[model samples]
Target: SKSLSPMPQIAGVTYYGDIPKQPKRVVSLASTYTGYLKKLDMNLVGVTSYDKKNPILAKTVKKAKQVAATDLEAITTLKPDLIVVGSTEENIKQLAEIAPVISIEARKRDYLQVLSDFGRIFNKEGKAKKWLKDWKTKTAAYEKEVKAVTGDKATFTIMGLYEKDVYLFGKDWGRGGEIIHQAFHYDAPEKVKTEVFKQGYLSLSQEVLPDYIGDYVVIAAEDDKTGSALYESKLWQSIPAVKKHHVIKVNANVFYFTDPLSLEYQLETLREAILSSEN
Candidate 1:
């Protein structure tokens, strides 16, 4: 009984076998979870890959192998003590065969639920709560500041242009959409609400850009080609957000991640933008 504590369960996943009081070699397929585990300083052995030079994660690539969720062979190479993942990973049974694998409910809940789950699973509650406190303290001012801004009748919409596709993002998927949609309950425009908000992301064509883009739009492109192509489109140039110059491109990499490490960067970057604008 002493060996078993109230371990967190998420999205129908709990440790299938005994979980160590402390996991020494964890493989995390969730990048945000990987960052949080390291924030708690858990014993991590591998992680899924993303931007390798980002300081919050650069140090990890050295010690953690870049693992793929579907790559059983690569995961086993790390000889992990445990694996933490997000939902929808195929074949939980297969991954569990390598090590004790747990899935957490991920999304805008990335902050509380994911943090709480990992903190408990690894018996790092003290550190988890400590980090949660620090997060609250860190965001307290910005949350209020942005709360005032968005509450000041300011609504937002975030979008990315990827060659053939236009994607709308919700707070849960990043691009600072959380600051606009989650940090405060600003009303995204109608079409966006009907289409993108419910779905996390909406894929459409460039012709429909104006329909879903709201008062302020965060314009990101998959690459230079996408940006240039969109720029050359009269439709892109004629959008209301563009006419008013209410469009901004955030550091897509930072905006793409929803972690404590990433959220702070997003909060600060977003706060500066929210205040600096004439709108």
Candidate 2:
């Protein structure tokens, strides 16, 4: 075993103290970080929100608190050995008071790199590599899944409809469009990709519905009003997807997340939706 004779560096920053063989009590200040730590089977003392409703996290971390990432009082009370968080410059200074924080932009910034970073920093390279391998294997298999049923890739669009808002998603920036555009070989219509998808998040008033919606529309419809208004609208009814039965619904909670755990869950859910379209 390698005994530490000197402090180690991590993710381009030097650890001024020591790296424990294992972090006994960890507090994750982001749900995404919670997912990464959960996968490693780490001891999680606290998480970002007390309102975190995930089924897996409930068992792993018993204490969830409603504290700001910058709130030193709430942070020290739990007394974490390591803190995983996305902190601004101001919050970073405050979080450093009680314990060393691995401040990162974990969500939707570059998911795989974040996983690798966690792997190297925590000495959970084996765990991180395994998850990455599984995700690559699973997400890549979507190409085969689509090819088997449709004989070719389908153009899919992922969106959310809430109140009067229709928001389109793209390759990154907190959306799952990458799953369709890259993983499954599904395409967004060229025009949509050019004018809207390139913009990352596209908002449209109701009138532009037909021109923008895809060959297959996977939507997160918040309620009957959200779901029905789109389904019942004259413009929506005229869209090819609506008529061809290629419209799909996605689980709003998990789909919005870009963490490794969320990706694992969405792999199956999203595959089922992609394989359902009759076009």
Candidate 3:
């Protein structure tokens, strides 16, 4: 009836699987969540190249080894106590052999929920609760401040261009989606509410782009050149949001995360752009 010690099991939540024991050395293959881990100050031994190169993430993961989901040997060398991944099929089974693995379904796109999951997993629930409360307070103030500048009827649109293909985003698809629509309580145009809001995202041809755009348009792109061709087009120039300079083009990498730090940075960027006289 005697044993050395039983491992503690961290209960699973919507995004995280149950993890055995609190992790001391974590290798996160989920690039999108590197910031989340950073917010927790997790002991990250390794992360993917995307997180390593991201300006916002670089400092946090600078000392960590760069590993891909398929890099079995490299990940094993890190000797991670826990492995956090974004999906299940990408060598997750093999990764599990080396460490307790938890797949965070980041697609849910709810940073608060994901943060709480991390809190539970790492036994940092107090910090997580404080963060949530602070975030809610800040967002409540933000919603009021933002609505004051734009007034009740001013709508906002989130769009991105991927190699010339334009896509519209709904309230929770990143690109400051949650901040713009949910936290700030901004509305999309009538057409966007009817179509894009239902599915979270929708692709549109250049011809029909104007119909879905709102008073203010937020465009996410890798670089200025990514949207240059479209930006130069007469159709693009003629859109009310474009013509009136009510458009803010942000770096896609920066806008891709909804973690606390990323959200704070995004809020500043969005606030400055939207509230400035230029808009």
Candidate 4:
């Protein structure tokens, strides 16, 4: 392998010093990109415990030290050559003192763009390009299958209940939003398109929630009981999709990610859920 050069600005972060070519000790603090590293078959040395919950990352994360982005001492112990993370302005200076840090805007950004950024860093552009080419083909096929079930004009609403609060998602904000709106080219409810689309996501006020629901409602809660208050209410029963049983509850952990690996799981989850729902 050849030595690497200093990285130009990527995902808004620039690494001034030379990065290790084919880095062996890679620690990923960004839970979203841990699977990306695994997809590229990088030698991951450490990752956050959150990423460990992902079954796709189980094999790699199990062997890596479980760490938090703020835990500088724990990360220092790992002696990593490369550290991948989402933007943490306060911590970036400190983390860079330990190893080369690549800060990516992982959330609300294009997943393929993020993958391409990783490819540049790892010198695995061929692998990244190959994977995306295949994924694009698969997703294209899904578009046809999904439209057959839900129809092209049927609108979608992707939301998550975290504790008692509800967050409505846009196309790029994970929770299967990318698959539902982007890959399938489904429309969003007028209210969602106007409000959430520009900002990526919106914290939905409980009173106006009914106005934003679409033909299908997909939810990923913090847990099974996290949204019982709303789920059991008569207000929930009043929604058209709920009455028609078009409401789909997805695994929060799996839908919480928008990476290549998780996208596969999410695509299947949404496809089956919509296909099985009585229209």
Candidate 5:
């Protein structure tokens, strides 16, 4: 048997060893969540938001070098081997003709599942499994600590004040809501459980903030000014969580919207918040 690329000149021979080579240059398209990129470890070549501070690589095409309506001429010029785009993206089909485009199903919920899927794609199954195991361990430790203090009976709500509206997050929407539910053993109110939107992105005017207030307010900060203002508001001050000094303002980057590593950071932040509230 002779190799295909070698000059062995063997008659009717077939190579039977290593598999074919896979393309290396990958482009991610329209990724709303930054955590996926970190998990994939894909070199982000470009994004919709040029600002590096909060790069929107999650929603952008895997190897996209341009934004919305630009000269895709530049992308064609790069000649990427694999262009990974999201199914939610409008121009996914068009981009496919330019290169072998792999459409990643847009993530709606379930962070763990999303990570697992990425692991499967990037040949990082072991990494994903380890992350899951570590997360479960950390969650168990946090649960033990919380049980020693609060005994899993405290009802709480996780709210994010965004653009003059309050969004309540349930068990599904990743970030602090899920972290608290898993780590602290806090009881979500019956109303939240029976709500139409299980994830609970409720939109309400600022005046009605207190109506959704909970025992502990996990303030997922989107911006400093708005978050600070909400913390200083009279209505916010009147909330039971605030009055009882149970408000925890978490870093949105690390807590609300992040990957496994960020989730671990959030878990630690949550543990400290719960412990501090005890005192």
Candidate 6:
């Protein structure tokens, strides 16, 4: 049975219709840029990044088999009943014309919400619930292990090291900082929490790196050039984490674009990184 596209709406909202049968064909446009799309276990036929990279999928849904650059052409050619677009994608109105495009809000940092949203969209509410339950159980165990080992004795800071500047991630950014805080119960400096709301973000000078240094440093791998430069620099090498060999290098995409299932992976990675450092 052919799957009919639901009427245009938000990604997490309910759809009314005869649900599509076994195999489903989905085409995502500018979705990789947002991060959540990649985490979805779906029949993703075609995916295009904001940078115009086409990630080819194994199956071709129709005879007019070429991937669509624009939404109109995609809908016309692929005739995908469902189209998923992120809230942050540029020039969304143009795409909305071809089909009912649901604009999903991408700002929230809670992994549970991300999973719930994905589950709702694909009519997998039951699966989402089960996954959430399993995740909580796993995270609770990890949290207990971390607490037993560190006992709230260690403080940490997460930063993105770019070639030109350094940025401190706060709780509101929905990425590295938040995940660490939630997973391990790491305390954020009072100053960070207070200022994060006012400034909405924070910048750190290279000179301030030592001052911001904590027991553990989670360096977000930005790019090969910048990340490598920082890894090899004298200033970075002198930081407490590096000096003590307590620094952990994490993938930027996983750290920055966390969703429910992704959080599980992130938590597992963190557990391994932290436990491996134990003497």
TM-score of each: 0.84, 0.81, 0.90, 0.93, 0.74, 0.75
1-279: candidate 1 lDDT, tens digit per residue: 125335655554556556656677888887756677777777767777663535556555576777788989988888877788776777678888988767765553555667766677667788879877876676666767865754656568888766677788876677777666766556688777777777789888778777876678876553466677676779988887778777777756556776667776766777787676655
Ranking by TM-score: 4, 3, 1, 2, 6, 5
Best by TM-score: 4
Task: Summarize candidate 5's per-residue lDDT along 203-255 as a digit string, tens digits.
Answer: 55668666666566777756777677667778778878789887777656445
Q: Rank the candidates by lDDT, best first.
A: 4, 3, 1, 2, 5, 6
Q: Tell me the lDDT of model 1 at 244.
A: 72
Question: Per-residue lDDT of 11-107 in model 4, one digit per residue for the tens?
Answer: 4655624677678889988888888888888888898777887765565567898888788998999988888878754688888888887777545
| Model 6 alpha-carbon drift over 4 Å, by segment | 1-23, 30-41, 50-76, 172-175, 197-200
Judge candidate 3 at residue 274 and give its lDDT.
78
The candidate, 3 or 4, that scores higher on lDDT is: 4
Which residue pairs overlap in candidate 3's backbone?
none
lDDT of model 4 at residue 53? 79
lDDT of 2 by residue, 53-153 (tens): 55434545555565557667877988777776664435665666677666664333356767767676677789989888977887777778866765564
- Runs in model 1 deviating more than 4 A are 1-5, 51-55, 105-110, 144-151, 276-279
Query: How far does residue 193 in candidate 3 sit from its true spot (Å)?
Result: 1.7
Model 1's alpha-carbon lDDT is: 0.70
110-161: candidate 3 lDDT, tens digit per residue: 6578787777667677888998899899888878877787887889999988
Over 60-150, each residue of candidate 6 has an lDDT whose tens digit, in order, gives 2222233444556656565554455666667567655544454555554254676666655556667778877887788778878876765
Q: How many backbone clashes does candidate 4 have?
A: 0
Score each candidate by Cα lDDT.
0.70, 0.66, 0.79, 0.82, 0.59, 0.58
Question: For each candidate, C-alpha RMSD in Å?
Answer: 3.1, 3.8, 3.3, 2.0, 8.7, 5.1
Q: In candidate 4, which residue pairs get closer than 3 Å at backbone N, Cα or C atoms, i.e. clash? A: none
Error of 2 at 147 (Å): 3.2
Residue 114, candidate 2: alpha-carbon lDDT = 72
Positional deviation of residue 76's Cα in model 2 after best superposition, in angstroms: 1.9
